[PDB]
UniProtKB/Swiss-Prot annotation:
Protein name: Dual E2 ubiquitin-conjugating enzyme/E3 ubiquitin-protein ligase BIRC6
Gene field: BIRC6
Superkingdom per UniProt: Eukaryota
Domain topic, free-text comment: The BIR domain is essential for its anti-apoptotic function and is important for binding to DIABLO/SMAC and caspases.
Full-protein residues shown: 55 to 965 of 4857
Annotated compartments: Golgi apparatus, trans-Golgi network membrane; Endosome; Cytoplasm, Cytoskeleton, Spindle pole; Cytoplasm, Cytoskeleton, Microtubule organizing center, Centrosome
Reported modifications of this chain: Ubiquitinated; mediated by RNF41 E3 ligase and leads to proteasomal degradation, impairing inhibition of apoptosis. Deubiquitinated by USP8/UBPY. Autoubiquitinated; mediated by E1 ubiquitin activating enzyme UBA6.
Family membership: Belongs to the BIRC6 family.
Native source organism of the sequence: Homo sapiens
Assembly and interaction partners: Homodimer; antiparallel. Interacts with RNF41. Interacts with DIABLO/SMAC, likely with higher affinity to SMAC dimer than SMAC monomer; this interaction blocks the substrate-binding site and inhibits the caspase inhibition activity of BIRC6. Interacts with KIF23/MKLP1, USP8/UBPY, BIRC5/survivin, MAP2K1/MEK1, RAB8A/RAB8, RAB11A/RAB11, PLK1, EXOC3/SEC6 and EXOC4/SEC8.
Tissue spec: Expressed in brain cancer cells.
WD repeat residue numbers: 14-52, 53-82, 325-372, 515-567, 568-605
Functional note: Anti-apoptotic protein known as inhibitor of apoptosis (IAP) which can regulate cell death by controlling caspases and by acting as an E3 ubiquitin-protein ligase. Unlike most IAPs, does not contain a RING domain and it is not a RING-type E3 ligase. Instead acts as a dual E2/E3 enzyme that combines ubiquitin conjugating (E2) and ubiquitin ligase (E3) activities in a single polypeptide. Ubiquitination is mediated by a non-canonical E1 ubiquitin activating enzyme UBA6.
BIR repeats: 214-323
Length: 605
């Protein structure tokens, strides 16, 4: 494993609080406190993107690279961005675009090259619609962007690919253009490739306004308007009591992906009815795969041939769910949160007071509205059983980690911020509070057994910046941070031997290093067959610590044994420390990233 020096180049010196990567379109998602994007080529130095797209600057662009399934969930200061488009592509330039409050807001459409060029074709090459309102302004914007790129087109077209036109046109022009295109494409019912584009634009126009959003027509014997169907969500929402789920290949998700709608009724239990020609079919069967059956009874469906005409797959169908604003003020601070490596559970901890979790498998619906009593005796009972005053609950983060009487409870801790004088002595103790996930058909949320942090861990009041389960999934790794050799750590075991889930009754070992000054700020855990050559030739992971002096220490977490030491390099031209600040595991590259505040890069072969 040779190591060589090649060179360095400034990449990012704007500061970093969280790290992420974008593996879909090979355009690195930059996490910045402002939202600006800067990309510089290293080998040739050619510019790939020259555009400062900022619809509403000042928002924290926080996205986390979930490498379990290689998906990134972008989160802004307002809502949660589940950008699941066709083939699961993501958006980079919309890092500062937020849901609108009025029609006066500035929106950055920033469509990719595909749909932007499709609009260009439908406006000049395919169809000529120059007589509509706002056509001149949009064409002028597109040609202005093209002319701006034309100077850099002599090198590459990626400038036009990413330095897109600032599509901040007023919503009235876009509304008029969308209405004209939809009318033209629906009066003759022509299924050209521009039909999905027109449908998507009209869907945005009719859904992004909560005031103009109609209701859902759910219920037998009730009619549904034909205008809202340009999204498949209406069809997918009717699969409430489908009784053929127990079929072999008629699983809920694949069958709903096909694009049918079923009214719950005793008649027509397995009756089939599609949309292409409204043919009355029968005999839904376990071996009757929905896509295969759709091709069998309707080969003219555009899904069969792959044409882009009224194509709304499951990802596009379920990626149009609306969002609601939790609070108008949000006076509660934002300190630390994360989603972990568990994409199945959506973890966007809104520490503003209200946290609602919607299951990905099921459809989004209104669930519950309530207010919390300020005199709950459960916490006081827990405190008293361990051994003037106003106690209130502030919901900060919900975390679900996994490998009745009592009710199933989970080690979900919250950041209690209450100050007491230190006759009383100020002490902080984590607590576990859970709501009623589902009735087990007593009082829901009864704690089974709580795991207490070690004495030294509570002594320094370390806060869990993030939670990351171990690779094997048996043991739990807890992240720690310190606000401005190992340190203070936690080590316990959970029992998974009995048929019913239980918990261990005795700690095994507690790691207490008498060196709190150099507490680990961040760390990663890797299987025993990645890092070391001996390990490669051969489950708790590998513990590598970083020192302020720049020395690199390689230790094996299995035995806490020091393996090798590497001296820090020397900065060129200046004596300032060339420290590595970025450390994150990217499944796209599988390398240990290292970006410096001074603007230098190094590669470890």
């Amino acid at each position: 494993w040779l190591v060589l020096r090649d060179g360095c180049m400034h990449c990012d010196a704007d500061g970093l609080h969280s790290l992420s990567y974008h593996p879909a379109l090979n355009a690195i998602l930059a996490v910045t406190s402002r939202g600006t994007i800067k990309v510089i080529d290293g080998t040739s130095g050619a510019t790939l993107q020259a555009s400062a797209l900022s619809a509403k600057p000042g928002g924290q662009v926080k996205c986390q690279y979930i490498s379990a399934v290689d998906k990134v969930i972008f989160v802004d200061d307002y809502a949660v961005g589940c950008r699941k488009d066709l083939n699961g592509i993501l958006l980079l330039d919309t890092a500062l675009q937020t849901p609108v409050s009025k029609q006066d807001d500035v929106v950055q459409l920033e469509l990719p090259v595909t749909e932007a060029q499709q609009l260009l074709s439908a406006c000049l090459e395919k169809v000529d619609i120059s007589s509509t309102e706002g056509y001149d302004l949009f064409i002028t914007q597109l040609k202005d962007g093209l002319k701006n790129t034309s100077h850099e087109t002599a090198a590459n077209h990626k400038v036009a690919k990413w330095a897109t036109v600032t599509f901040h046109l007023p919503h009235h022009v876009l509304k008029s253009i969308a209405s004209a295109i939809v009318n033209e494409l629906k009066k003759i019912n022509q299924n050209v490739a521009a039909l999905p584009v027109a449908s998507s634009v009209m869907d945005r126009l009719s859904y992004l306004l909560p005031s103009a959003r109609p209701e859902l027509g759910v219920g037998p014997g009730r009619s549904v308007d034909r205008s809202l169907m340009y999204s498949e969500a209406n069809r997918r929402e009717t699969f409430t009591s489908w009784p053929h789920v127990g079929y072999r290949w008629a699983q809920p998700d694949p069958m709903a992906q096909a694009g049918f709608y079923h009214q719950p009724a005793s008649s027509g239990d397995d009756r089939a009815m599609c949309f292409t020609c409204s043919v009355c079919l029968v005999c839904w069967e376990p071996t009757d795969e929905p896509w295969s059956e759709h091709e069998r009874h309707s080969p003219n469906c555009p899904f069969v041939k792959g044409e882009h005409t009224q194509n709304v797959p499951l990802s596009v169908t379920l990626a149009t769910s609306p969002a609601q604003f939790p609070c108008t003020d949000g006076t509660d601070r934002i300190s630390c949160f994360g989603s972990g490596s568990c994409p199945h559970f959506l973890a966007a901890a809104t520490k503003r007071g209200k946290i609602c979790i919607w299951d990905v498998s099921k459809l989004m619906k209104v669930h519950l509205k309530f207010e919390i009593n300020a005199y709950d005796p459960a916490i006081v009972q827990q405190l008293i059983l361990s051994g003037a005053m106003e106690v209130s609950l502030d919901i900060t983060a919900l975390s679900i980690l996994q490998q009745n009487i009592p009710f199933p409870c989970l080690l979900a801790g919250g950041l209690l911020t209450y100050k007491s004088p230190a006759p009383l002595v100020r002490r902080t103790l984590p607590v576990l509070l859970l709501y009623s996930i589902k009735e087990s058909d007593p009082k829901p949320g009864t704690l089974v057994q709580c795991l207490r942090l070690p004495k030294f861990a509570e002594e320094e009041n370390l806060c869990i910046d993030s939670i990351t389960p171990c690779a094997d999934g048996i043991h739990l790794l807890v992240g720690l941070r310190t606000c401005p050799s190992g340190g203070y750590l936690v080590l316990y075991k959970m029992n998974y031997a009995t048929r019913i889930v239980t918990l261990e009754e005795e700690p095994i070992k507690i790691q207490h290093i008498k060196d709190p000054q150099d507490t680990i700020t961040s760390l990663i855990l890797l299987p025993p067959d990645i890092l070391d050559n001996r390990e490669d030739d051969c489950t708790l992971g590998h513990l590598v610590i970083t020192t302020q002096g720049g020395y690199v220490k390689i230790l094996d977490l299995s035995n806490f044994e020091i393996l090798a030491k590497v001296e820090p390099p020397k900065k060129e031209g200046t004596e300032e420390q060339d420290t590595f600040v970025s450390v994150i595991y990217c499944s796209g590259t599988d390398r240990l990233c290292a970006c410096t505040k001074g603007g230098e890069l190094h590669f470890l072969q």
